[PDB]
Amino acid sequence: MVAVSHAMLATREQEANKDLTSPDAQAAFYKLLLQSNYPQYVVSRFETPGIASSPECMELYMEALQRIGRHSEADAVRQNLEHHHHHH
């Protein structure tokens, strides 16, 4: 039984802030927020067009929406996943 440290979360966030145009770094941050019970944070961030987004990120966003009882927003995200661009 090993306890989880809060410092890990901070480090990852710092990297993301330094570079917001790297979808990879963003994806990791999104995951961390969900694990630590921060769905509200996931939403506020994902909605800022300045930060990168990847398919993985989209899924993370959807999960957060569910947690906070935002049904409408969740449905919208799903539709986006169904059609990426041209091929489903």
Contacts of range 46-53, beta carbons closer than 8 Å, 24 or more positions apart: 50/20, 51/16, 51/20, 51/26, 52/20, 52/21, 52/22, 52/23, 52/25, 52/26, 53/23, 53/26
* Tokens encoding 68: 């906070």
Report which of 49, 30, 47 is spatially closest to residue 38, judged by C-alpha positions.
Answer: 30
> Which amino acid, one-letter code, is at 12?
R
**Quick one: 49 exposed, middle or buried, by C-beta within 10 A (0-12, 13-18, 19+)?**
exposed
Closest of 40, 37, 79 to residue 58, by C-alpha? 79
The number of beta carbons lying within 10 Å of the beta carbon of residue 10 is 10
- Tally of domains in the chain: 1
Distance CA 2, CA 9 (A): 16
Structure tokens at 86: 């041209």
Domain ranges, residue 20: 1-88
